[PDB]
């Protein structure tokens, strides 16, 4: 309505008023509105806005329960057809059957779109936010009921692919590439010798590659289930947010293996080879747009135990004092320079996740859940849009996969990495820090001498890749 049948029975023929929808500033964008009016627009008969669907199914849970959504869209799907009209009523009563010129106008302009646009909501809701269903069987049951007992011939094609998606989903990535991936590079440690593997004996190029594969794999697993509603900060962080947590813990670990590799290499020459080999990795991380890895390395250099090692960084080559400082400048001034580089590289990349976390969390905890206009309480939707904006920016980088050959052994080495061992965060932090005080003690105490620990050559293979037959 739009047109024709009595508006009484159908809940969504409510007319649009200042008391139930609010707009903003070539579709229209919704600032706020009642729950009904929001679903009416989610399946409006005039235009399909497919971004609005994703914004809704990403975020709707904060203002409406899954069971009550289903009920609500079912209700919308069931649309009162116009009573056989006045030239219909006179054609039925003199023999033959009517022509129905404004029953079919209504059925083609209103009922056809709204029903199809609703099936598109279920197709998304199932194929994309299936968690709502694996945490409620009755919901799945009702939804499956609903779909079966739809009976059009128009909707016959689309009922069919939804019944089959719900099946595929109730159980369980073939990737095609253009070009081949470069050959895996080896240094001191030879293939299959997993025990000799360490920061100095693995090829710096191939460290950065395998840790970019691993860190991409981790970034990609984050669903927006684990993000919306600041769930990664509440007491059930571990239940609701396990993949997000899994990759923050990874990043946090590697930053610690780097800190530990530096301050435990007691000898000065040997430590300067290690600090340098890390900056040579940071440099390959950047070639691969692995920001998460760059910000590990910059974050490790910045840490208390490693920052203070002035005698060690005085000896870094001049080219790498440049590389390190420039990567540090990314984080400077509210990650100004980094958000720059990100919104301008040509992916695949691996963003630094922490910024997205903070923006989601401030936006939730800084915008009203409702809007009191005329003593009515409209759902504040521009807030839900802003959150979905982010979770979309995040989904956006999860698309393109890296063209790098995974090395089984090197990857199992970094997964099974644990610099902390059995000690706690305070215990280990302090230890690292005292090894810093030991290997390069405060002034004026004189810089002592320690012995070499590495039996292998400390020269780097260089971070220029080497391509044979």
């Amino acid at each position: 309505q739009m047109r024709l049948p009595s508006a009484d029975v159908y809940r969504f023929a409510e007319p649009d008023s200042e008391e139930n929808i609010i707009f903003e500033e070539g579709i229209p964008i919704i600032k706020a509105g009642t729950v009904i009016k929001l679903i009416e627009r989610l399946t409006y008969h005039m235009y399909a806005d497919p971004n609005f669907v994703r914004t809704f199914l990403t975020t709707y849970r904060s203002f409406c329960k899954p069971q009550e959504l289903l009920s609500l869209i079912i209700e919308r799907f069931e649309i009162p057809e116009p009573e056989p009209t006045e030239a219909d009523r006179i054609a039925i009563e003199n023999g033959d059957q009517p022509l129905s010129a404004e029953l079919k106008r209504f059925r083609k302009e209103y009922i056809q779109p709204v029903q199809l646009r609703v099936l598109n909501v279920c197709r998304h809701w199932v194929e994309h936010h299936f968690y709502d269903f694996e945490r409620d069987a009755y919901l799945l049951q009702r939804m499956e009921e609903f779909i079966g007992t739809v009976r059009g011939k128009a909707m016959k094609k689309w009922v069919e692919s939804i019944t089959k998606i719900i099946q595929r989903k109730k159980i369980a990535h073939n990737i095609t590439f253009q070009s081949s991936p470069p050959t895996v590079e080896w240094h001191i440690s030879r293939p299959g010798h997993i025990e000799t593997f360490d920061l100095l004996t693995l090829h710096p190029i191939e460290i950065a590659r395998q840790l970019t594969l691993l860190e991409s794999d981790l970034y990609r697993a984050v669903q927006p289930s684990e993000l919306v509603g600041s769930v990664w900060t509440k007491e059930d962080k571990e239940i609701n947010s396990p993949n997000l947590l899994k990759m923050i813990r990874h990043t946090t670990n590697l930053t610690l293996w780097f800190e530990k590799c530096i301050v435990e290499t007691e000898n000065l020459e040997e430590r300067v080879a290690v600090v340098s080999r890390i900056i040579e990795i940071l440099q390959v991380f950047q070639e691969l747009n692995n920001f998460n890895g760059v910000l590990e390395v910059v974050s490790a250099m910045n840490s208390s135990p490693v920052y203070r090692l002035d005698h060690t960084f005085e000896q870094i080559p001049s080219r790498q004092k440049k590389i390190l400082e420039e990567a540090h400048e990314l984080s400077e001034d509210h990650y100004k320079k980094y958000l720059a580089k990100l919104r301008s590289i040509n992916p695949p990349c691996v963003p630094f996740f922490g910024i997205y976390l903070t923006n989601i969390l401030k936006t939730e905890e800084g915008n009203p859940e409702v809007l009191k206009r005329h003593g009515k309480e409209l759902i504040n939707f521009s807030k839900r849009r802003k959150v979905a904006e982010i979770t979309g920016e995040i989904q956006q980088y999860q698309n393109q996969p890296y063209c790098l050959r995974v090395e089984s052994d090197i990857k199992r080495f970094f997964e099974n990495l644990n610099p902390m061992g059995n000690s706690m965060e305070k215990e280990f932090t302090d230890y690292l820090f005292n090894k810093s005080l030991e290997i390069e003690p405060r002034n004026p105490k004189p810089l002592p001498r320690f012995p070499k620990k590495y039996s292998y050559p400390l020269k780097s293979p260089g971070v220029r890749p080497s391509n044979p037959r």
């Binding site: 994703r54 689309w158 990737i175 095609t176 590439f177 253009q178 301008s344 040509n346 956006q396 393109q400």
Partner: protein, 166 residues
């Protein structure tokens, strides 16, 4: 960062969805699931610009022939797809160019005719037949496969180069 809104249009079941996914995710969809209205974004760099591609994958079946003039209204450039094993889908191209030229009130609309599904020898629409039409419209003709990735990037980015210079 310039921002381009591409729209894929075509016959039912030619590979509008299968291509768009291959472009965004490097994955070949095998299942045929009739599309009603999906939408995708891809940040990519084309001839030294960072372009944010905004790809709208439309519905092909005649059931949604009601609900076209809405996306055709806001699109920037159009990817007209047909499959080289379905001659009917090629004959339907004429009309797609037409709905676009009408809804856009313009004769100069960035498009690219795409001949998909070319990993099969079952070809029934000949290369000439298709090329000849493309020249009649004054637009490039690029043959692609979603399954093998051949030509996929080529076709989508040619559209972007076209939108830029116009």
């Amino acid at each position: 960062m310039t921002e381009y809104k591409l729209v894929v249009v075509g016959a039912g079941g030619v590979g509008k969805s299968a291509l768009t996914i291959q472009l965004i995710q490097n994955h070949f969809v095998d299942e045929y699931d009739p599309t009603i209205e999906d939408s995708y974004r891809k940040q990519v760099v084309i001839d030294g610009e960072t372009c944010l591609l905004d790809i709208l994958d439309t519905a092909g079946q005649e059931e949604a022939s009601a609900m076209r003039d809405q996306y055709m209204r806001t699109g920037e450039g159009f990817l007209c797809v047909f499959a080289i094993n379905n001659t009917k889908s090629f004959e339907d191209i004429h009309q797609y160019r037409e709905q676009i030229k009408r809804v856009k009130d313009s004769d100069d609309v960035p498009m690219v005719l795409v001949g998909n599904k070319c990993d099969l020898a079952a070809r029934t629409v000949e290369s000439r037949q298709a090329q000849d039409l493309a020249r009649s419209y004054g637009i490039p003709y690029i043959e692609t496969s979603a399954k093998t990735r051949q030509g996929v990037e080529d076709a989508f980015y040619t559209l972007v180069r076209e939108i830029r210079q116009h």
